[PDB]
């Protein structure tokens, strides 16, 4: 229901940066879109923004697993 | 619109011996459907039955149906003369018909995503 | 495909490999072929 405390695969503490990563990510996407209605922002276009440098700025390594689970984990607070 | 004839077999008076059969005829006048309701057990009216309440209590999410009718009968004698009677029935709760979830007859039609989420329904 | 089509594609010739990706007509023909094998495998239990 949230980004996990640790990476499911290796156990790196990805959760200690999860909250920040969420909020920062949102702001970052609002920079790349240019002030659009939340529905007029298509879902497929919000996912094509590269989050590589943002995750690196969080101090997270270049591990495939950690970034997979950080980027793709669904938050329940946005579905209910 | 039912219309049939049945042979009568009452043989006590002379006036009974003057008759042949009874012509049955009747129809229904006004039909309407209201939302599902519940009793709450206080000797009162019917209160709204929410879907989760029916899920939990093992009830049925059925709304009562209201019908009106007209019953007009004919009486046939031996000679060939007839006696016609008429009767009017006001709106009358016939039975409860099941209600589909999310339809016009459902309570979660006037209720939005927040309202569905608040009472114990799936908002999506 | 039009009526009385003479091209080989109209009757189930697939020019694409799986790694290249089939098209809609080729996927349908391959779906027709695959469904036959499932049905015959369903007759495997009952008939014998």
């Amino acid at each position: 229901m949230l980004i996990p405390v640790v990476c499911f695969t290796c156990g790196f503490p990805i959760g200690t940066y999860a909250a920040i990563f969420d909020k920062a990510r949102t702001e970052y996407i609002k920079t790349k879109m240019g002030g659009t209605l939340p529905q007029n922002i298509p879902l497929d276009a919000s996912l094509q923004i590269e989050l590589k440098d943002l995750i690196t700025a969080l101090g997270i390594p270049m591990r495939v697993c950690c970034r997979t689970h950080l980027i793709t984990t669904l938050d329940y607070r946005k579905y209910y | 619109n039912v219309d049939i004839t049945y042979k009568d077999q009452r043989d006590h008076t002379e006036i009974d011996k003057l008759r042949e059969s009874v012509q049955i005829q009747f129809n229904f006048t006004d039909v309407n459907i209201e939302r599902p309701q519940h009793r709450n057990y206080s000797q009162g009216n019917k209160i709204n039955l929410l879907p989760n309440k029916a899920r939990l209590c093992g009830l049925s999410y059925s709304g009562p149906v209201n019908l009106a009718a007209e019953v007009i009968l004919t009486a046939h004698y031996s000679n060939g003369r007839q006696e016609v009677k008429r009767a009017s029935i006001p709106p009358f709760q016939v039975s409860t018909f099941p209600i589909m979830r999310g339809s016009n007859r459902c309570h979660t039609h006037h209720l939005s995503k927040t309202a569905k989420k608040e009472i114990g329904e799936d908002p999506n | 495909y039009p009526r009385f089509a003479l091209e080989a594609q109209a009757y189930g010739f697939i020019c694409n490999s799986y790694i290249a990706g089939l098209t809609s007509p080729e996927f349908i023909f391959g779906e027709m072929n695959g469904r036959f094998d499932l049905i015959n495998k369903a007759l495997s239990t009952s008939s014998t």
Binding site: - | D8, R10, V22, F26, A69, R86, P98 | -
Partner: protein, 240 residues
């Protein structure tokens, strides 16, 4: 269509039960008796001498010369009314005492009118239910026979039982209605009939007033009817 050559018609419905009538009698009851007109009701022409039309008249001419055990004395009959009379002789379930209602005049007309109106509504009801639509019901039934003989002809394939140009998907509303009514038949009007039966069996009808009509109507619709109807409707939905 049979191996011998007879072309027959069965009308499955509530009133009747799987009776098969040769393809000429249905046409003759409706006012079209001449054989040339009837062969123009299926082949649509008598002046085209091609393979299809020659073989069509061959099959249909051979069809009308078979002796069905049920329609022997009504095989070459000339008019409509006595054909309908024999129809009543056959299908009338409540008539089991022949040679008696024929001694009077009114019963013949009553049976003829009843069998005229039922077959006016029970045959091809999508074309109408009044007498003015009977004539074109003849033409449409002829067209159906023609289409069937074209498949006998090996000219067109039979109907594909799996293509979706001849399928429909109904769903909740239609099935719920047709089950709300199929069980309405047993638990409502039959109880009303029986309640009126037992009200007439006890209380004098010339003494019966409106109050007792209301009493009997609300008695025949007591909790047994409402219970049985809804229980059978839910049992039908859950049983499959």
């Amino acid at each position: 269509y049979m191996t011998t050559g007879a072309i027959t018609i069965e009308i499955n419905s509530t009133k009747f039960s799987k009776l098969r009538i040769p393809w000429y009698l249905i046409f003759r009851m409706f006012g079209m008796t001449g054989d040339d007109s009837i062969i123009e009701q299926v082949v649509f022409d008598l002046e085209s001498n091609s393979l299809v039309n020659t073989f069509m008249i061959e099959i249909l001419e051979k069809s009308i010369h078979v002796l069905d055990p049920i329609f022997q004395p009504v095989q070459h009959e000339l008019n409509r009314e006595k054909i309908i009379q024999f129809l009543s002789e056959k299908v009338s379930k409540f008539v089991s005492n022949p040679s008696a209602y024929k001694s009077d005049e009114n019963a013949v007309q009553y049976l003829n009118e009843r069998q005229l109106t039922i077959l006016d509504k029970i045959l091809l009801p999508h074309m109408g239910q009044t007498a003015d639509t009977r004539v074109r019901k003849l033409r449409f039934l002829g067209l159906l026979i023609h289409k069937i003989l074209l498949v006998i002809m090996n000219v067109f394939p039979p109907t594909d039982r799996d293509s979706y140009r001849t399928k429909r998907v109904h769903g909740s509303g239609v099935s719920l209605a047709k089950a709300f009514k199929a069980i309405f038949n047993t638990s409502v009007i039959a109880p009303i009939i029986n309640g009126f039966k037992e009200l007439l069996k006890q209380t004098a009808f010339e003494e019966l007033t409106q109050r007792n009509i209301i009493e009997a109507f609300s008695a025949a619709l007591s909790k047994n009817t409402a219970s049985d109807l809804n229980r059978s409707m839910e049992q039908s939905i859950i049983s499959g």
